[PDB]
Amino acid sequence: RSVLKNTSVIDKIESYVKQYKPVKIDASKQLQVIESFEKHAMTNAKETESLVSKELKD
Amino acid sequence: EVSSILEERIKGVSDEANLNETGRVLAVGDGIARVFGLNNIQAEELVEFSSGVKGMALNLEPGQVGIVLFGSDRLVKEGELVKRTGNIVDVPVGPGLLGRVVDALGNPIDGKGPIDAAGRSRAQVKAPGILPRRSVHEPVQTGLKAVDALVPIGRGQRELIIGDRQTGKTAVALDTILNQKRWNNGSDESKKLYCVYVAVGQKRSTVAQLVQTLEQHDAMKYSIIVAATASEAAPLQYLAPFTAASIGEWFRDNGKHALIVYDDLSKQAVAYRQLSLLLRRPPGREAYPGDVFYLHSRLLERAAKLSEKEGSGSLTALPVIETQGGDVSAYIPTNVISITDGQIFLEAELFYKGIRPAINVGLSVSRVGSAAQVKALKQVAGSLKLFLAQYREVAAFAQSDLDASTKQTLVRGERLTQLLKQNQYSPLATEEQVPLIYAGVNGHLDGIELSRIGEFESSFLSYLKSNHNELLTEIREKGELSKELLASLKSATESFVAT
Amino acid sequence: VRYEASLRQLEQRQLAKSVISRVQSELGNPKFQEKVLQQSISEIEQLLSK
C-alpha cells in the first residue's frame, strides 16, 4: 500500500477482500453417500469373507 | 512529489572550480577524436568533451592523445574544450546494484532511480594470483539435467558455451540463472550465487525480452544485467565485459558466490576489432586486433575461486561464444577455447532433432569435472556417462540383423537420450535430478516405450512427491546417497514402473 | 502501481519540457549581461583562492 501514491483504492480492495474473506462456504456431502456406500460394501465384503472362510475349512 | 525531486536536483548542482588540463580537438573523425593538449593524462583515463560525450584515451601518442568517443560522432566537432575527468575507467560496484539494469558506464538504464553503490572500482584490475586461488570444490547446479550430469559446473571455473549461431545459446545460459533461484531464496549465505548477466552487443529489444523474462520468473532480485546494446558506441561495447567483471568483484571480494555469464564474447571480439583498426594500431591475424588473445585472456581469468585465506569467495564465469557455421577452427573461437577451462558444445543438428538443450554429449568436456557434481548425483550418474558413450558408438549400427547385445545397448541408449531432454525455460531442482536419472541408470525405464518416456518423467516426479516425499527430502538434505537410501529408491522406482 | 509509476514518469518529462521553455526566457534577459559580472568576480575569487 505504501508503494502506491494514488491510494484511495487500496483501502477499497483491502476492505473488499477482508469483507468477502469467506469466498466459498464449506461442503460436506460425504456423510450421506459415504454411509450408504459403506453399507452395501460392508455387507458384500462380509458375505464374501464368511463364505470363503467356510469354504477353506470345508 | 516529482516537483520536489526536481527542486532537490537544481539545489543539488553547485558551482564548479578550476579544472586542470584542457584539450582542443585536433581532428575528430571516425569516432576517434584526436585531441591536442591534455598534458598529464593517465593512460586509459576517462576524458569528457565539451559536448558532453565521454571518452577514454586508449592511445597516448607522442604529440596528441587519441580519445575514443563513447557516443555519436556528431556530438564532438573540431576544436572544443576537452576536460580531463581524472579517474581511470571505473564503474559503481556494491551490494546495491542487485536488481538494476545498468549500462557500461554504470548509469541506471532501468530507470529505477540512482544506483546506490558502495564503491567505485577500476575496470582493468588484475586477476587473483597463484597463492590466492584455492581449487574448485563446491558444486553449482545449473538445473539442466544434461548439464548437471554430463558436464558438471563448479564454483569459480570458467567453462565455455560455444555453439552454432542462434541455436538459442542464450537459452542454455538463462536456464542456469533461473535455477539459482532455488538456493538463492533461502537464508544460507554460503549457498547464494548472485548472478550478473552481461549482455554485450544484443539488440535493445532482445535485452528488453531478457529483462521481462527474468521478471516473469521472479528472478530479478539476484540479477544485475550490465547491458551494452548493439546501438551503443563501439567503446562502450569494448568496455562492456571489463566493466562487468568489476561488478562481479564486489561479490567475489566480499565473500559471496556469484556467476557472471558473458554473453557473447564473440561480439566482444568484434568490438575490439572496431576500436583497434580505427585507431590504426597494427592489424593482425584474420584482421582481428593484434593482442586479441591477450584481451580475452585478461577478461576470463578474473574468474577464480578464492582460498580460505582470502575469504573463500568465488566468481564462476560462463562465456558464450558463437561459432560461425560451427567452424571451431576460427581464430576468435580457437583463442577462447584455449583460454577457457571446459566447453559445452551445443550442436545445431541436435537442436533440429528435438534435443533441446542441445548439448552434444560427445564434444562437451568438463576439465574440473568431478570436483563439482553433488555427491549424490555423482554416485548415481557415473553410469550415465558410460552408458551414453556406448550408445554413441553403436549409433550408426541402427541402420538390421543386429546382435542381442547391440540391441540391448540401443534400447537403453535411445531411452536415455530421450530422457535427458528438458523443456525450455524451466529449471529442475537437484533433488529431482537424482531420482530421474536413477531410473534410467538402473534400467527401469528401458522397458517404457519412447513415446511414453516424457509422460513417465512427469509422472515419476508426481509419484515421488506423493508416495515418498520423505525419500525426496532425504535425498535433498543428506546430499549423499547411502546404501539404505539407494535401497529405498530402488523400491520406489520398482513401484513406479509397475504402475 | 504500474500506472501510478507511469504517471510519475509522465510528470517528470512534462515538467522537463516546461523547464526548457523557462530556459529560453532566461537567456533573453539582460541577466545575460548582469550575470557576466557575477562570473567575472567569481573567477577573480576562485583563481586567487588557488
Coordinates of C-alpha atoms in Angstrom, one line a residue:
Chain A
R1 CA 0.0 0.0 0.0
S2 CA 2.9 2.4 0.8
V3 CA 4.2 1.9 -2.8
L4 CA 1.0 3.4 -4.3
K5 CA 0.7 7.2 -4.3
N6 CA -2.8 7.1 -5.7
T7 CA -4.0 5.3 -2.6
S8 CA -7.8 5.5 -2.2
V9 CA -8.4 2.2 -3.8
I10 CA -6.1 0.1 -1.6
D11 CA -8.4 0.7 1.3
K12 CA -11.3 -0.3 -1.1
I13 CA -9.9 -3.6 -2.2
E14 CA -8.3 -4.3 1.2
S15 CA -11.7 -4.0 2.9
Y16 CA -13.4 -5.8 0.0
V17 CA -11.1 -8.7 0.3
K18 CA -11.4 -8.8 4.0
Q19 CA -15.2 -8.5 3.8
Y20 CA -15.6 -11.3 1.3
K21 CA -12.9 -13.3 3.0
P22 CA -15.2 -16.3 3.0
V23 CA -15.0 -16.7 -0.8
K24 CA -16.7 -20.1 -0.7
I25 CA -18.7 -21.9 2.0
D26 CA -18.0 -25.4 3.2
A27 CA -19.2 -28.6 1.6
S28 CA -19.6 -31.9 3.4
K29 CA -21.7 -34.1 1.1
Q30 CA -19.7 -37.2 2.0
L31 CA -21.8 -38.2 5.0
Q32 CA -25.0 -39.3 3.2
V33 CA -23.4 -41.0 0.3
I34 CA -20.4 -42.5 2.1
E35 CA -22.6 -44.2 4.7
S36 CA -24.9 -45.7 2.0
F37 CA -21.9 -46.9 0.0
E38 CA -20.3 -48.3 3.1
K39 CA -23.4 -50.3 4.0
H40 CA -23.6 -52.1 0.6
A41 CA -19.8 -52.5 0.5
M42 CA -19.6 -53.8 4.1
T43 CA -22.5 -56.3 3.5
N44 CA -20.9 -57.6 0.3
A45 CA -17.4 -57.7 1.9
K46 CA -18.6 -59.7 5.0
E47 CA -20.6 -62.1 2.8
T48 CA -17.5 -62.8 0.7
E49 CA -15.4 -63.1 3.9
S50 CA -17.6 -65.6 5.7
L51 CA -18.3 -67.6 2.6
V52 CA -14.7 -68.2 1.7
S53 CA -13.7 -68.8 5.3
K54 CA -16.3 -71.5 5.5
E55 CA -15.1 -72.9 2.1
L56 CA -11.5 -73.0 3.3
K57 CA -12.3 -75.2 6.2
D58 CA -14.7 -77.3 4.1
Chain B
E1 CA 6.4 14.9 -5.5
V2 CA 8.3 14.9 -8.8
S3 CA 8.4 18.7 -8.4
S4 CA 10.1 18.3 -5.0
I5 CA 12.6 15.9 -6.5
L6 CA 13.5 18.4 -9.3
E7 CA 13.8 21.2 -6.8
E8 CA 16.2 18.9 -4.8
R9 CA 18.1 18.3 -8.0
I10 CA 18.6 22.0 -9.0
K11 CA 19.7 22.6 -5.5
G12 CA 21.9 19.5 -5.9
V13 CA 24.1 21.1 -8.5
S14 CA 26.6 23.5 -7.3
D15 CA 29.1 25.9 -8.9
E16 CA 32.4 24.3 -10.1
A17 CA 36.0 25.1 -9.5
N18 CA 39.0 25.5 -11.8
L19 CA 39.5 22.4 -13.9
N20 CA 43.1 21.2 -14.6
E21 CA 44.0 20.3 -18.2
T22 CA 42.1 21.0 -21.3
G23 CA 42.4 20.0 -24.9
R24 CA 41.2 21.2 -28.1
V25 CA 40.2 18.5 -30.6
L26 CA 42.7 18.5 -33.4
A27 CA 40.6 16.4 -35.7
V28 CA 37.6 14.2 -34.9
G29 CA 36.7 11.6 -37.4
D30 CA 35.5 8.0 -37.3
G31 CA 34.6 8.3 -33.6
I32 CA 38.3 8.6 -32.8
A33 CA 38.8 12.2 -31.8
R34 CA 42.5 13.1 -31.5
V35 CA 43.0 15.9 -29.2
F36 CA 46.0 18.2 -28.9
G37 CA 46.6 19.1 -25.2
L38 CA 45.9 17.1 -22.1
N39 CA 49.5 17.5 -20.8
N40 CA 49.1 15.0 -18.0
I41 CA 46.6 12.3 -18.8
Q42 CA 46.7 8.9 -17.2
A43 CA 46.5 6.1 -19.7
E44 CA 43.0 4.8 -20.3
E45 CA 41.7 7.7 -18.3
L46 CA 38.2 9.0 -18.9
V47 CA 38.1 12.4 -20.6
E48 CA 34.8 14.4 -21.1
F49 CA 34.2 16.6 -24.1
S50 CA 32.6 20.0 -24.3
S51 CA 29.5 18.4 -26.0
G52 CA 29.0 16.0 -23.1
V53 CA 30.2 12.7 -24.6
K54 CA 32.6 10.8 -22.5
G55 CA 35.6 9.0 -23.9
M56 CA 38.7 7.2 -22.8
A57 CA 42.2 7.7 -24.1
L58 CA 43.4 4.4 -25.4
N59 CA 46.3 5.9 -27.4
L60 CA 48.6 8.4 -25.7
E61 CA 50.6 9.3 -28.8
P62 CA 53.7 11.4 -28.7
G63 CA 52.0 14.7 -29.6
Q64 CA 48.3 14.0 -29.4
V65 CA 46.2 11.9 -27.1
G66 CA 43.7 9.9 -29.1
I67 CA 40.4 9.8 -27.2
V68 CA 37.8 7.3 -28.4
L69 CA 34.3 8.7 -28.3
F70 CA 31.7 6.8 -26.3
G71 CA 28.8 8.3 -28.3
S72 CA 27.8 9.5 -31.7
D73 CA 30.3 11.3 -33.9
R74 CA 28.1 14.3 -34.3
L75 CA 28.4 15.3 -30.7
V76 CA 32.1 16.4 -30.9
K77 CA 33.1 18.9 -33.5
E78 CA 36.7 20.1 -34.4
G79 CA 38.2 22.3 -31.7
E80 CA 36.3 22.4 -28.4
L81 CA 37.5 22.1 -24.8
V82 CA 38.2 18.5 -23.8
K83 CA 38.0 18.3 -20.0
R84 CA 40.0 15.7 -18.0
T85 CA 37.7 13.7 -15.7
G86 CA 40.8 12.4 -14.0
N87 CA 39.8 8.9 -12.9
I88 CA 40.7 5.8 -15.0
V89 CA 37.6 3.9 -16.1
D90 CA 35.7 2.8 -13.1
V91 CA 32.0 1.8 -12.5
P92 CA 30.0 1.8 -9.3
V93 CA 30.2 -1.6 -7.6
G94 CA 28.3 -2.6 -4.5
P95 CA 25.6 -4.8 -3.0
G96 CA 23.1 -2.2 -4.1
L97 CA 23.4 -2.9 -7.7
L98 CA 21.3 -6.0 -7.2
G99 CA 18.2 -5.7 -9.4
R100 CA 19.2 -2.8 -11.7
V101 CA 19.9 -2.9 -15.4
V102 CA 22.9 -0.6 -15.8
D103 CA 25.0 0.4 -18.8
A104 CA 28.7 0.1 -19.2
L105 CA 29.4 3.5 -17.6
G106 CA 27.2 2.3 -14.7
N107 CA 24.4 4.8 -15.2
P108 CA 20.9 3.4 -14.4
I109 CA 19.3 2.5 -17.7
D110 CA 16.5 0.6 -16.0
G111 CA 15.2 4.0 -14.8
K112 CA 14.6 2.8 -11.3
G113 CA 16.4 5.9 -9.8
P114 CA 20.0 6.4 -8.8
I115 CA 22.2 3.3 -8.4
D116 CA 23.2 3.1 -4.8
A117 CA 26.7 1.6 -4.7
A118 CA 29.3 1.1 -2.1
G119 CA 32.5 1.7 -4.1
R120 CA 33.7 2.6 -7.5
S121 CA 36.4 0.2 -8.6
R122 CA 38.6 0.3 -11.6
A123 CA 37.7 -1.7 -14.7
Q124 CA 41.0 -3.2 -15.6
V125 CA 42.3 -4.6 -12.2
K126 CA 44.5 -7.7 -12.4
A127 CA 43.3 -11.3 -11.6
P128 CA 43.8 -13.3 -8.4
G129 CA 47.3 -14.8 -8.2
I130 CA 48.8 -18.3 -7.7
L131 CA 48.7 -18.2 -3.9
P132 CA 45.3 -16.5 -3.6
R133 CA 43.4 -19.2 -5.6
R134 CA 42.3 -22.5 -4.0
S135 CA 41.0 -25.3 -6.1
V136 CA 37.3 -25.7 -7.0
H137 CA 35.3 -27.7 -4.5
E138 CA 31.6 -26.5 -4.4
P139 CA 29.1 -27.7 -7.0
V140 CA 27.0 -25.2 -8.9
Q141 CA 23.9 -27.0 -10.1
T142 CA 22.6 -25.3 -13.2
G143 CA 19.4 -27.3 -13.1
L144 CA 19.5 -28.6 -16.6
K145 CA 19.7 -32.3 -16.3
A146 CA 22.1 -32.7 -19.2
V147 CA 24.5 -30.0 -17.9
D148 CA 24.4 -31.3 -14.3
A149 CA 25.2 -34.9 -15.1
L150 CA 27.1 -34.9 -18.3
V151 CA 29.2 -31.8 -17.8
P152 CA 29.4 -30.7 -14.0
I153 CA 30.0 -26.9 -13.4
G154 CA 31.7 -26.0 -10.2
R155 CA 32.2 -22.7 -8.4
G156 CA 34.8 -20.4 -9.8
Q157 CA 35.9 -22.1 -13.0
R158 CA 35.2 -20.7 -16.4
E159 CA 33.5 -23.0 -18.9
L160 CA 32.7 -22.1 -22.4
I161 CA 29.2 -22.3 -24.0
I162 CA 30.4 -22.4 -27.6
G163 CA 27.9 -23.3 -30.2
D164 CA 26.2 -22.6 -33.5
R165 CA 24.7 -19.3 -34.4
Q166 CA 21.3 -18.6 -32.9
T167 CA 20.6 -22.2 -31.7
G168 CA 19.3 -20.5 -28.6
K169 CA 22.7 -20.4 -27.0
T170 CA 21.4 -17.8 -24.6
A171 CA 18.6 -20.1 -23.5
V172 CA 21.1 -22.6 -22.1
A173 CA 22.7 -19.9 -20.1
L174 CA 19.4 -18.3 -19.0
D175 CA 18.3 -21.6 -17.6
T176 CA 21.3 -21.6 -15.2
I177 CA 20.2 -18.2 -13.9
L178 CA 16.7 -19.5 -13.2
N179 CA 17.9 -22.5 -11.2
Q180 CA 19.9 -20.3 -8.9
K181 CA 16.6 -19.0 -7.5
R182 CA 16.1 -22.2 -5.5
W183 CA 19.2 -21.8 -3.4
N184 CA 19.0 -18.0 -3.5
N185 CA 15.6 -17.6 -1.9
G186 CA 16.7 -19.1 1.4
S187 CA 18.8 -17.9 4.3
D188 CA 22.1 -19.9 3.8
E189 CA 24.6 -17.3 2.8
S190 CA 27.2 -19.8 1.8
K191 CA 24.8 -21.0 -0.8
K192 CA 23.6 -17.9 -2.6
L193 CA 25.1 -17.4 -6.1
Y194 CA 24.3 -13.8 -7.1
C195 CA 24.3 -14.0 -10.9
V196 CA 25.2 -11.0 -13.2
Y197 CA 24.4 -11.4 -16.9
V198 CA 26.4 -9.3 -19.3
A199 CA 24.6 -8.7 -22.5
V200 CA 27.1 -7.4 -25.0
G201 CA 26.1 -6.4 -28.4
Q202 CA 22.5 -7.7 -28.3
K203 CA 19.7 -5.5 -29.7
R204 CA 17.8 -3.4 -27.2
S205 CA 14.7 -5.4 -28.0
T206 CA 16.4 -8.6 -27.1
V207 CA 17.7 -7.2 -23.8
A208 CA 14.2 -6.0 -23.1
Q209 CA 12.9 -9.5 -23.6
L210 CA 15.6 -10.8 -21.2
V211 CA 14.5 -8.2 -18.6
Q212 CA 10.9 -9.3 -18.9
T213 CA 11.7 -13.0 -18.8
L214 CA 13.8 -12.6 -15.6
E215 CA 11.0 -10.5 -14.1
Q216 CA 8.4 -13.2 -15.1
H217 CA 10.3 -16.0 -13.4
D218 CA 10.7 -13.6 -10.4
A219 CA 14.5 -13.7 -10.8
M220 CA 15.4 -10.1 -10.7
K221 CA 16.5 -9.9 -7.1
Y222 CA 19.8 -11.6 -7.6
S223 CA 20.4 -10.5 -11.1
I224 CA 22.3 -7.4 -12.3
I225 CA 22.3 -7.1 -16.1
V226 CA 25.1 -5.0 -17.5
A227 CA 23.8 -4.3 -20.9
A228 CA 25.7 -2.6 -23.7
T229 CA 23.3 -3.0 -26.6
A230 CA 24.1 -3.1 -30.3
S231 CA 23.2 0.5 -30.7
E232 CA 25.7 1.7 -28.1
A233 CA 29.0 3.1 -29.3
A234 CA 32.0 0.8 -30.0
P235 CA 34.0 1.9 -27.0
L236 CA 31.1 1.2 -24.7
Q237 CA 30.8 -2.3 -26.3
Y238 CA 34.6 -2.7 -25.8
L239 CA 34.5 -1.9 -22.1
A240 CA 31.4 -3.9 -21.5
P241 CA 32.8 -7.2 -20.2
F242 CA 35.6 -5.5 -18.5
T243 CA 33.1 -3.3 -16.6
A244 CA 31.1 -6.3 -15.8
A245 CA 34.0 -8.1 -14.2
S246 CA 34.3 -5.2 -11.8
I247 CA 30.6 -5.6 -10.8
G248 CA 31.5 -9.2 -10.1
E249 CA 34.5 -8.3 -7.9
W250 CA 32.3 -6.9 -5.1
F251 CA 30.7 -10.3 -4.8
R252 CA 34.0 -12.2 -5.0
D253 CA 35.9 -9.9 -2.6
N254 CA 33.1 -9.6 -0.1
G255 CA 33.0 -13.4 0.0
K256 CA 29.6 -14.2 -1.5
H257 CA 29.5 -16.6 -4.5
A258 CA 28.5 -15.3 -7.9
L259 CA 28.4 -16.4 -11.5
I260 CA 28.9 -13.9 -14.3
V261 CA 27.9 -15.1 -17.7
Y262 CA 29.5 -13.1 -20.5
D263 CA 27.2 -13.3 -23.5
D264 CA 28.6 -13.4 -26.1
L265 CA 32.4 -12.9 -26.2
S266 CA 32.2 -13.4 -30.0
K267 CA 30.6 -9.9 -30.2
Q268 CA 33.1 -8.6 -27.6
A269 CA 35.8 -9.5 -30.1
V270 CA 34.2 -7.7 -32.9
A271 CA 34.0 -4.5 -30.8
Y272 CA 37.8 -4.7 -30.0
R273 CA 38.5 -5.1 -33.7
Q274 CA 36.5 -2.0 -34.4
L275 CA 38.4 0.1 -31.9
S276 CA 41.8 -1.1 -32.9
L277 CA 41.5 -0.9 -36.6
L278 CA 40.0 2.6 -36.3
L279 CA 42.9 3.7 -34.1
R280 CA 45.3 2.4 -36.7
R281 CA 47.0 0.1 -34.3
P282 CA 48.8 -2.6 -36.4
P283 CA 46.3 -5.2 -37.9
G284 CA 46.8 -8.9 -37.2
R285 CA 45.5 -12.4 -37.9
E286 CA 42.1 -12.7 -39.5
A287 CA 42.0 -8.9 -39.2
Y288 CA 41.4 -9.2 -35.5
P289 CA 43.4 -6.8 -33.3
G290 CA 46.9 -7.9 -32.7
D291 CA 46.7 -8.6 -29.0
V292 CA 43.3 -10.2 -29.2
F293 CA 44.4 -13.3 -27.3
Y294 CA 45.7 -11.1 -24.6
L295 CA 42.4 -9.2 -24.3
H296 CA 40.2 -12.3 -24.0
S297 CA 42.7 -13.9 -21.6
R298 CA 42.6 -10.8 -19.3
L299 CA 38.8 -10.9 -19.0
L300 CA 38.4 -14.6 -18.5
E301 CA 41.0 -15.1 -15.8
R302 CA 39.4 -12.6 -13.4
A303 CA 37.2 -15.6 -12.6
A304 CA 38.7 -17.7 -9.8
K305 CA 37.9 -19.5 -6.6
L306 CA 39.5 -17.7 -3.7
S307 CA 41.4 -19.5 -0.9
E308 CA 40.2 -19.8 2.6
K309 CA 42.9 -17.2 3.5
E310 CA 41.3 -14.8 1.1
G311 CA 37.7 -15.2 2.4
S312 CA 36.6 -18.2 0.4
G313 CA 34.7 -16.2 -2.3
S314 CA 34.2 -17.4 -5.9
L315 CA 33.3 -15.9 -9.2
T316 CA 32.2 -18.6 -11.6
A317 CA 32.1 -17.5 -15.2
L318 CA 30.5 -18.8 -18.3
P319 CA 31.5 -17.1 -21.6
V320 CA 29.2 -17.8 -24.6
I321 CA 30.9 -18.0 -28.0
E322 CA 29.1 -18.0 -31.2
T323 CA 30.6 -20.3 -33.8
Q324 CA 30.1 -19.0 -37.2
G325 CA 28.9 -22.1 -39.2
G326 CA 30.3 -24.3 -36.5
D327 CA 33.9 -23.8 -37.6
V328 CA 35.7 -24.3 -34.3
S329 CA 39.0 -23.6 -36.1
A330 CA 38.1 -19.9 -36.5
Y331 CA 40.6 -17.5 -34.9
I332 CA 38.3 -15.9 -32.3
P333 CA 36.8 -19.3 -31.2
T334 CA 40.2 -21.0 -31.1
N335 CA 41.7 -18.4 -28.9
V336 CA 38.8 -18.6 -26.5
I337 CA 38.7 -22.4 -26.5
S338 CA 42.3 -22.4 -25.3
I339 CA 41.7 -19.8 -22.6
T340 CA 38.6 -21.5 -21.1
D341 CA 38.6 -24.5 -18.8
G342 CA 35.8 -26.6 -20.3
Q343 CA 33.4 -26.4 -23.1
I344 CA 29.7 -27.1 -23.7
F345 CA 29.2 -27.6 -27.4
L346 CA 25.7 -27.0 -28.5
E347 CA 25.1 -28.6 -31.9
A348 CA 22.6 -27.3 -34.4
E349 CA 21.7 -30.8 -35.7
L350 CA 20.7 -31.9 -32.2
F351 CA 18.6 -28.7 -31.8
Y352 CA 16.8 -29.6 -35.0
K353 CA 16.5 -33.2 -33.9
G354 CA 14.4 -32.1 -30.9
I355 CA 17.1 -32.5 -28.2
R356 CA 16.8 -29.1 -26.5
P357 CA 19.0 -28.3 -24.6
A358 CA 21.1 -29.5 -27.5
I359 CA 24.3 -30.3 -25.7
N360 CA 26.4 -32.6 -27.8
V361 CA 27.4 -35.2 -25.2
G362 CA 30.5 -36.2 -27.1
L363 CA 32.1 -32.9 -27.8
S364 CA 31.5 -31.3 -24.4
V365 CA 34.1 -31.8 -21.8
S366 CA 34.4 -30.6 -18.2
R367 CA 38.0 -30.1 -17.1
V368 CA 37.2 -29.5 -13.5
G369 CA 34.7 -32.3 -13.6
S370 CA 34.3 -34.5 -10.5
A371 CA 35.2 -31.6 -8.1
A372 CA 31.7 -30.4 -8.9
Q373 CA 28.5 -32.5 -9.1
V374 CA 26.6 -33.0 -5.9
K375 CA 27.9 -36.2 -4.2
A376 CA 24.5 -37.8 -4.5
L377 CA 24.2 -37.0 -8.2
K378 CA 27.8 -38.2 -8.8
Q379 CA 27.1 -41.6 -7.4
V380 CA 24.0 -42.4 -9.5
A381 CA 25.2 -40.9 -12.7
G382 CA 28.8 -42.2 -13.2
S383 CA 27.0 -45.0 -15.0
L384 CA 25.1 -42.4 -17.1
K385 CA 28.3 -41.2 -18.7
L386 CA 29.4 -44.6 -19.6
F387 CA 26.0 -45.8 -21.0
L388 CA 25.7 -42.8 -23.3
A389 CA 29.2 -43.4 -24.6
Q390 CA 28.2 -46.9 -25.8
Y391 CA 25.0 -45.5 -27.3
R392 CA 27.0 -43.1 -29.4
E393 CA 29.4 -45.7 -30.7
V394 CA 26.6 -48.2 -31.5
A395 CA 24.5 -45.4 -33.0
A396 CA 25.4 -45.9 -36.6
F397 CA 24.6 -49.7 -36.4
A398 CA 20.9 -48.6 -36.2
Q399 CA 20.6 -48.9 -40.0
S400 CA 19.2 -54.7 -39.4
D401 CA 20.2 -58.2 -38.2
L402 CA 21.8 -57.0 -35.0
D403 CA 23.2 -58.9 -32.1
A404 CA 21.2 -59.1 -28.9
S405 CA 23.9 -57.2 -27.1
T406 CA 23.8 -54.5 -29.7
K407 CA 20.0 -54.4 -29.4
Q408 CA 20.2 -54.1 -25.6
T409 CA 22.5 -51.0 -26.0
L410 CA 20.2 -49.5 -28.5
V411 CA 17.1 -49.8 -26.3
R412 CA 18.8 -48.4 -23.2
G413 CA 20.6 -45.7 -25.2
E414 CA 17.5 -44.4 -27.0
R415 CA 15.6 -44.3 -23.8
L416 CA 18.3 -42.4 -22.0
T417 CA 18.7 -39.8 -24.8
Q418 CA 15.0 -39.2 -24.8
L419 CA 15.1 -38.9 -21.0
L420 CA 17.7 -36.1 -20.9
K421 CA 15.5 -33.6 -22.8
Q422 CA 14.4 -30.6 -20.6
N423 CA 11.5 -28.3 -21.5
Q424 CA 12.8 -24.9 -22.4
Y425 CA 12.9 -22.1 -19.8
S426 CA 12.2 -24.2 -16.8
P427 CA 14.9 -25.4 -14.4
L428 CA 14.6 -28.6 -12.4
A429 CA 15.7 -29.0 -8.8
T430 CA 18.7 -31.2 -8.0
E431 CA 16.7 -33.2 -5.5
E432 CA 14.6 -34.4 -8.5
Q433 CA 17.6 -34.7 -10.8
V434 CA 19.0 -37.6 -8.7
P435 CA 15.7 -39.6 -8.8
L436 CA 15.0 -39.2 -12.5
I437 CA 18.5 -40.2 -13.6
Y438 CA 18.4 -43.1 -11.1
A439 CA 15.6 -44.7 -13.0
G440 CA 17.3 -44.6 -16.4
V441 CA 20.6 -45.8 -14.9
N442 CA 19.0 -48.8 -13.1
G443 CA 17.3 -49.6 -16.4
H444 CA 13.8 -49.4 -15.0
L445 CA 12.7 -47.1 -17.9
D446 CA 14.3 -49.3 -20.5
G447 CA 11.0 -51.2 -20.9
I448 CA 9.0 -48.0 -21.3
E449 CA 8.4 -47.1 -24.9
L450 CA 9.9 -43.9 -26.3
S451 CA 6.7 -42.0 -26.8
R452 CA 5.8 -42.5 -23.2
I453 CA 9.2 -41.6 -21.8
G454 CA 8.2 -37.9 -21.5
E455 CA 4.9 -38.8 -19.7
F456 CA 6.8 -41.1 -17.4
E457 CA 9.2 -38.3 -16.4
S458 CA 6.5 -36.0 -15.1
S459 CA 4.6 -38.9 -13.6
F460 CA 7.7 -40.2 -11.7
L461 CA 8.1 -36.8 -10.2
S462 CA 4.4 -36.6 -9.0
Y463 CA 4.7 -40.2 -7.8
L464 CA 7.8 -39.4 -5.9
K465 CA 6.1 -36.4 -4.3
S466 CA 3.0 -38.3 -3.3
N467 CA 4.5 -41.7 -2.3
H468 CA 7.6 -40.7 -0.6
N469 CA 8.4 -37.0 -0.3
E470 CA 10.3 -38.3 2.7
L471 CA 12.6 -40.0 0.2
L472 CA 12.9 -36.8 -1.8
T473 CA 13.6 -34.7 1.3
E474 CA 16.2 -37.2 2.5
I475 CA 17.9 -37.1 -0.9
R476 CA 17.9 -33.3 -0.9
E477 CA 19.2 -32.7 2.5
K478 CA 21.6 -35.5 3.1
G479 CA 23.0 -34.8 -0.3
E480 CA 24.8 -38.1 -0.4
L481 CA 23.2 -41.4 -1.2
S482 CA 23.8 -44.0 1.4
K483 CA 23.1 -47.7 0.5
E484 CA 19.9 -47.5 2.6
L485 CA 18.7 -44.5 0.6
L486 CA 19.6 -46.2 -2.6
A487 CA 17.7 -49.2 -1.3
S488 CA 14.6 -47.2 -0.7
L489 CA 15.0 -45.6 -4.1
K490 CA 15.2 -49.0 -5.9
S491 CA 11.9 -50.0 -4.3
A492 CA 10.3 -46.7 -5.2
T493 CA 11.3 -47.0 -8.8
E494 CA 10.0 -50.6 -8.9
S495 CA 6.7 -49.4 -7.6
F496 CA 6.5 -46.5 -10.0
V497 CA 7.4 -48.6 -13.0
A498 CA 4.9 -51.2 -12.1
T499 CA 2.1 -48.6 -12.3
Chain C
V1 CA 1.1 0.7 -9.1
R2 CA 2.1 0.4 -12.7
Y3 CA 0.1 3.4 -14.0
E4 CA 1.0 5.4 -10.9
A5 CA 4.6 5.0 -11.7
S6 CA 3.9 5.7 -15.4
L7 CA 2.1 8.9 -14.4
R8 CA 5.1 10.0 -12.3
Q9 CA 7.3 9.4 -15.4
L10 CA 4.8 11.4 -17.5
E11 CA 5.0 14.2 -14.9
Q12 CA 8.8 14.2 -15.0
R13 CA 9.1 14.6 -18.8
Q14 CA 6.2 17.2 -18.8
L15 CA 7.8 19.5 -16.2
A16 CA 11.1 19.0 -18.0
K17 CA 9.9 20.4 -21.3
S18 CA 8.4 23.3 -19.3
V19 CA 11.8 23.9 -17.8
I20 CA 13.2 24.2 -21.4
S21 CA 10.6 26.9 -22.0
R22 CA 11.8 28.8 -18.9
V23 CA 15.4 28.5 -20.1
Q24 CA 14.6 30.1 -23.4
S25 CA 13.2 33.0 -21.4
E26 CA 16.2 33.3 -19.1
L27 CA 18.8 33.6 -21.9
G28 CA 16.9 36.5 -23.4
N29 CA 17.1 38.8 -20.3
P30 CA 19.9 41.3 -19.7
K31 CA 20.5 39.0 -16.8
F32 CA 22.5 37.6 -19.6
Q33 CA 24.6 40.7 -19.2
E34 CA 24.4 41.1 -15.5
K35 CA 25.5 37.6 -14.6
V36 CA 28.7 38.0 -16.6
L37 CA 29.6 40.5 -13.9
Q38 CA 28.9 37.8 -11.3
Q39 CA 31.0 35.3 -13.2
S40 CA 33.8 37.9 -13.5
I41 CA 34.0 38.4 -9.8
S42 CA 33.6 34.7 -9.2
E43 CA 36.6 33.9 -11.4
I44 CA 38.6 36.5 -9.6
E45 CA 37.7 35.0 -6.3
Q46 CA 38.3 31.5 -7.5
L47 CA 41.7 31.9 -9.2
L48 CA 43.0 33.9 -6.3
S49 CA 41.9 31.3 -3.9
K50 CA 44.2 28.8 -5.6

